[model samples]
Structures are given as structure tokens and as C-alpha cells.
Target chain A: QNKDPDELRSKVPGEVTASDWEALVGDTRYGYFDETGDWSWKGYFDEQGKWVWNE
Target chain B: QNKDPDELRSKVPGEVTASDWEALVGDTRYGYFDETGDWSWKGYFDEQGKWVWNE
Candidate 1:
């Protein structure tokens, strides 16, 4: 239930790869890999810890 | 428990003001107004529906 589950991983930030960010923040719902192998936050977090549609 | 809590408010996209976005998504826990009057997501949501540190 922790957002910063990986404190050590999150601290080393600055143009981090999407997979690394996901490792720090955990897998976000509705995340998809682009041609560059980067993930985007297409969905948003809700109060109930669920991913709601951004579209 | 719904992420898209304000479906009606969220539809008005394109460089929306922070307050408007908050109204659309509802106020996030660690959101704060800056000099430009924009709100930022300083905290993150956890699985248990709590705000975890982004710092």
C-alpha cells in the first residue's frame, strides 16, 4: 500500500527510464509501452487506489 | 473510490488551470497552489487510499 515502495530506487531520479520509474512507483494501471519502451500514465490514480480513465 | 470522479469537469481539456483540473479530478492530498496558481501532485496515492511522499 506504499507509493514510495522503493525509496532507494526513487531517489536516483533524473530522466529515468519508464521501467525504472514503474519499479519505484510500481506498475500503474493502463500503462503501455511505446516504441521507445517507455511507459506513460495514460490512467490516473483515484482516491480508492484505482486507475481511472484519462480519456 | 472512483478515479474519474468528475467526468463532466474533466472534458474541458487544453491547458486547463490547476484549480479547474482539481475540480475535475477532485482535490489531491498534497496538492498546493504555486505562484502561477497551478496545483501540483506532490503526493502520490497508495493501494490503501493514502497519500505517500513524493519527496
Candidate 2:
């Protein structure tokens, strides 16, 4: 199951905006990798709420 | 082939740091996806230079 939008929203950095939250909510595919602690797979939403790598 | 670290570094946002670039260089795994225009697979290095999703 995907993480709740609200939960993920809370984890988001303050720089991220409301519109970005909406995009994140709409893209419910985040669970594809499952929420794990593996830093290799770590990622976050950008200021625009777009997904980006933590490579 | 993987995109050159220098090339990707140029595209990186200013907030990203030197340490992050080193990590990206070490990963050398980005070629797994190949360069493409598809936004669905779009991603960027975070302020920390980690790979994250653009979804």
C-alpha cells in the first residue's frame, strides 16, 4: 500500500509547496519501491514537488 | 553509457554540494535508465546529491 499523502506531506521539507503535494498525491506509484531505509533508493520531492534522486 | 559527472554536475542546482557530486560519481549506476525525455522517469539529484524520483 502507498503511504498516506498527509504522512508524506508531513515529512516533506518546508520548501515544498501545496501544489507539489497535490502532484505527489496524484502519483500514487511511490509504493513501487516500498518504503525502505536503503539509502541507495532514497529520494525526495523537490521544491516543485517533483521526484528527484538522492544519488 | 552513463552521462558524465561533469555534465550532470553542470545541470545540478546550486544548492547541491561537492560531497554530493562525489557520491553521484561513485554510484555510476545512472546508466541503468539511459537518457530520455520521458518525465515519468525524470529525476534529479537532491540538495544532498542523492537520486530521487520526479513522480
Candidate 3:
């Protein structure tokens, strides 16, 4: 349902070691909300490796 | 209940709004799960302001 929980941890900013960004976005359960209360950007990348948002 | 969703956005590495923080957190339903898969850092702060993790 979540595509894979571990997969969620993979969401990190570029040049950011998951370690650095992890503290900010490692929480998979909450479904990364970003800085805008926006569920629009959960960091789900498409096959092209492009960031995609949700509905 | 959730200590207020708006208030929930008040976490950070040291900057910005809970809005930015809301990205990494805020989904109380699933709970937070840092990158280590180490739920120890769920980022739940008490009234005194302390990070509390689930058992």
C-alpha cells in the first residue's frame, strides 16, 4: 500500500546523505508532508527518476 | 488530540516552519519512522519538549 516502507526512507534531498536528511524525512508512516502542509510532494519518484507529487 | 496539526509542524534541524517539518512528520495515523528504521526517533516531543519514541 505504501509502495514499501523502506522505500520511504530513500526520500532525501539531493547531495544529502540519507543520514543528514533522514532526521528530516525518515518517517515513512506519516507520509512526508514537506514544509507546506502539502501532501502534494511526498517524494515519490517516477521511473524517469523525477520527483512526483500525490493528489 | 494531535496536540494540534499546526503545532505538529514545529520540528526542524534548526529552521523554518512546522510547515517544512510537516513534510517529514504530521501523519499521526501511520506514526514517524526515521531512516534507520529505528523508530526511536519518531520526534514526539512532550510538553517539556523532549523527543519520545514508541515502544
Give lDDT tens digits, candidate 2, residues A1-55. 3454335532344344334433444343442334563223335654344454344
Candidate 2 fraction of reference contacts recovered: 0.04
TM-score of chain A of 3: 0.28
Considering TM-score, where higher is better, how would the candidates rank from best to worst? Answer: 1, 2, 3
Instruction: Report the TM-score of chain B alone for all candidates.
Output: 0.39, 0.28, 0.26
How well is each residue in A1-55 modelled by candidate 1, as lDDT tens digits?
Answer: 3343222232222212233334434254445767787765544444332334445
Q: Kindly report the fnat of each predicted structure, to 2 decimals.
A: 0.00, 0.04, 0.00
Of the pair 1 and 3, which is ahead by lDDT?
1
Please, what are the lDDT tens digits per residue for candidate 2 over residues B1-55?
3454335542344344334333343353432334573222344554444454443
Spell out the clash pairs found in candidate 3.
A27-B33, A33-B23, A34-B23, A35-B19, A35-B20, B9-B18
lDDT: the better of candidates 2 and 3:
2
After superposition, candidate 2 runs with Cα above 4 Å error: A1-42, A50-55, B1-7, B10-38, B49-55
Better of 1 and 3 by DockQ: 1
* Two-chain complex of model 3, DockQ on C-alpha atoms against the true structure: 0.03
Candidate 3: residue A19 lDDT (0-100): 37
Per-candidate TM equals 0.27, 0.25, 0.19
Question: Candidate 1: lDDT of A9?
Answer: 31
